[PDB]
Design a protein around this nucleic acid. Structure first.
Lengths: 82, 97, 97, 109, 80, 98, 95, 106
DNA sequence: ATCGATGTATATATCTGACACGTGCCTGGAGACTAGGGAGTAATCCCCTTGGCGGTTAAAACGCGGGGGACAGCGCGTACGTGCGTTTAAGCGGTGCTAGAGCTGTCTACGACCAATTGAGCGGCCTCGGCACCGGGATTCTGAT
DNA sequence: ATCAGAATCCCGGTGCCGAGGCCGCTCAATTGGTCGTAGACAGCTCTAGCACCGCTTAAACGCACGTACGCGCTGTCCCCCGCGTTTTAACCGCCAAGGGGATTACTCCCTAGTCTCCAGGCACGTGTCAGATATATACATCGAT
């Protein structure tokens, strides 16, 4: 059972994500806040994708399942099938 | 002439209301809101089940598709209880004719 | 020795990562995080490599757009540092919080 | 010929299984529609109606009223978290808003 | 015309009060009139599109509900 | 001296009163004239059902009220109480409307 | 079946029509194919809702035109609508 | 000898495939003859617009091959297609090179 | 200004794998013919939208005083950016194997379809009680003392 | 703490109009039967996901240090609030007209369905060239003086 993998989203990764977003200066609690936000977003999308998977009676989460999960929330993603 | 039939969920909403609140009534605008809500949630669940059947190359909308569409759209406690009610209704209906 | 003025390496990083296209989260810890999150919904799951890649693309796009709105609402408070209250405001205005 | 029995009565529902079946067939959702699909859908619609109507009747009692008006539906929806999530993008006409003042704006001593 | 000024300053103040606003700058009124003119233009353009498709000459409530639904904001109690 | 409430008391009373009620806060003939003026640009000689203008007004008022909620939140975020147009612009930009 | 259906060749033909010296990456090809599928699904769903609202049982050029005017932004909608009627005119003339 | 419907309409997109997708996609019980023609023309236009702006973007980066970065630049730089794809994420597309004025050095 | 550090762009050469083209096939699209039903068109009716008059009253407009809040300036201290040495694990490349996605074949349960029946559901009519409007006393709450 | 005044809450009375119920009708759901087909299940293939080992090296991490920025405090002035007075136009009611929205009936043409065929598009294969990588270098920009 995989555990404590939310800290694998390291502090420099969050700082790079902020730099791409245009953020020039970052607080110290932004890292924990961003890990929580990312955990919530991933929980929602992975729950929708695992629901799509279980409907097809598969055990492997297809990329098209993730695309349909994203489309369901309105976060349409191009480049992994239509 | 005679106005053509406009179907609405008014009487069914009223039956459910008399079941949950036997003495509480409902205005006409609130009944129109409940009718719009039932139509909206119906078209959401039906569109999601349609998309589910289309994704899996299938051509029938079953209780499976409606259950998965309820799991997708409805929030988790609401989805869990709606799935319990729908499953209970499909079993009791299949048990009878 | 020679040292840069606090803020120009940050702007250099901003220009670098806004000109670039690579993924900014390491792929193996993000994949492990995806596995850990998905084990709750269903055990013994499997993921296509493209599925984890799509999840990572969506996560990085979402976090980058959230940081854009966070930056905007931090400048709105006449600041340059982004605080957690900036993220909370951006999510509350977006309609997710 | 056997006495006619409504599908809703067979399923133990108040919502019309037959009308939901006709709407699923005419709604252009699939070329075919299962037999338990309108039963399941009518059960889900009846449950969601029961949830909102119970909370709205509670809100109408709290305002010492015996009719449900759009204000009571709005209060019932926005006061429950899960239904407010389900109806987040939804505007309820004549519903008003939730009474909510930010604590910074309140006066001080 | 003068019709956008028909959305008076006290009406905008009442809308802000329902939104929970305690203090209002003087330029909020023109800003809000502009915001309302653009939201109204988008909804009405889509409603008139739905009307012209039906080969009608009147804008029905249903068309407004459909235009709103396309915008992603759903209105209950006007039909649908 | 005639009694005067301290600046911001009547504002809070108005907040409570208009959050307690459900009537439409824009006068119906000005909003109706505005709707017809705007629709004059998309098709000439249009007509409106009364309920169409009523639905447009309900939607417009709900949109403006939610916008003023977000505007107030981002005004308080800037350690302020007055809402400025830059607050509205921030709320619309974060909401993906600009 | 082993075959999969995509708009690769048609996108390439349009690309050669527009910029007859430029290739396109496989990732960009997948993005263009998913873009065509997504826009098709939007326009078709809007035309289906349109035919359902007016109690019609057929998608015609009018419903596609109205769905284009609904979803596409005004410059894009205007030029796509004018060309679409030109294409329908060309098809009916040639039969 | 059979002449294809795309050549009749004067399009590159397949009128036959669009008609088949309309008929099987459960949009209506019937599909008019001009509907796939109109839809194929509109889809071909959006493809042509995206690809024209992406080819311009590829020329700006001195490339002769459209990659996702050029599609992202084409989409986010044009306004109409940014409105059209405002809720859409493009994989490997990156962001627009935008820095806020307040953060620039004094 | 200025020069030095310094990262970043630019120009050229090797490689490499992925894209652009060919081929064979097969299955999906085109020509042709059919029925039938959906949509186009024309007449009708009525309802519901538009337009006008009048009053009247509540709301909008305007003026004004002032207070409190926006905003600018300043000081400080601490948290964050930058750099550097260390360490840690991500990445890449090869290899294994087996679970499970995916395809095919078969057949039976199940849903479309259709005709006859009828009872549930809808439109219309009527009435009474919930709610709304009015008015007046009670309570709350605010601000000046 | 107190107290007066303004606003709101509450309590009761009267009315009114819309919600609730009843009844006729009609058409849409039910029942019973038939038939095609789709999807459930078995079985076979073979792809790719998971697991592992090893090496490398670039990224993460811990820490030191300085300083820029967040934040708290203070003063000022301006501009929004709140209230009194005037004006105006929104609203209610009432009436008139007509136009267009909904309905029905008739027709015809336009699309589904089937057949027959054939060519376009899509796996497989291949080769070659654009771009990735590497290296040196030039160049502009940042910084301390």
């Amino acid at each position: 059972v995989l555990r404590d993998n939310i800290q694998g989203i390291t502090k420099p990764a969050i700082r790079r994500l902020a730099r791409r977003g245009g953020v020039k200066r970052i607080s110290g609690l932004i890292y924990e806040e961003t890990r929580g936000v990312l955990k919530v977003f991933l929980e929602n999308v992975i729950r929708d994708a695992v629901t799509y998977t279980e409907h097809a009676k598969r055990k492997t989460v297809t990329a098209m399942d993730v695309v349909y999960a994203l489309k369901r929330q309105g976060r349409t993603l191009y480049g992994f099938g239509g | 002439r005679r106005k053509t039939r406009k179907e609405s969920y008014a009487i069914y909403v009223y039956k459910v209301l008399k079941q949950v609140h036997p003495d509480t009534g409902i205005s006409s605008k609130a009944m129109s809101i409940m009718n719009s809500f039932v139509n909206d949630v119906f078209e959401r669940i039906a569109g999601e089940a349609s998309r589910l059947a289309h994704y899996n190359k299938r051509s029938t909308i079953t209780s499976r598709e409606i259950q998965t569409a309820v799991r997708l759209l409805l929030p988790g406690e609401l989805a869990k209880h709606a799935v319990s009610e729908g499953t209970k209704a499909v079993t009791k209906y299949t048990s009878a004719k | 020795p020679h040292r840069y003025r606090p803020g120009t390496v940050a702007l250099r990083e901003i220009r670098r990562y806004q000109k670039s296209t690579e993924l900014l989260i390491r792929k193996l810890p993000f994949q492990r995080l995806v596995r850990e999150i998905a084990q709750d919904f269903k055990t013994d799951l499997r993921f296509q490599s493209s599925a984890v890649m799509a999840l990572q693309e969506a996560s990085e796009a979402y976090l980058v757009a959230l940081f854009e709105d966070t930056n905007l609402c931090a400048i709105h408070a006449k600041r340059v540092t982004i605080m957690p209250k900036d993220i909370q405001l951006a999510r509350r205005i977006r309609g997710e919080r | 010929r056997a006495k006619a029995k409504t599908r809703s009565s067979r399923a133990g529902l108040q919502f019309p299984v037959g009308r939901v079946h006709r709407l699923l067939r005419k709604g252009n959702y699939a070329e075919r529609v299962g037999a338990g699909a309108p039963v399941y859908l009518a059960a889900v619609l009846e449950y969601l109606t029961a949830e909102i109507l119970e909370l709205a009747g509670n809100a109408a009692r709290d305002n010492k009223k015996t009719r449900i008006i759009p204000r009571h539906l709005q209060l019932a929806v926005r006061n429950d978290e899960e239904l407010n999530k389900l109806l987040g993008r939804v505007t309820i006409a004549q519903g008003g808003v939730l009474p909510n003042i930010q604590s910074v704006l309140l006066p001080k001593k």
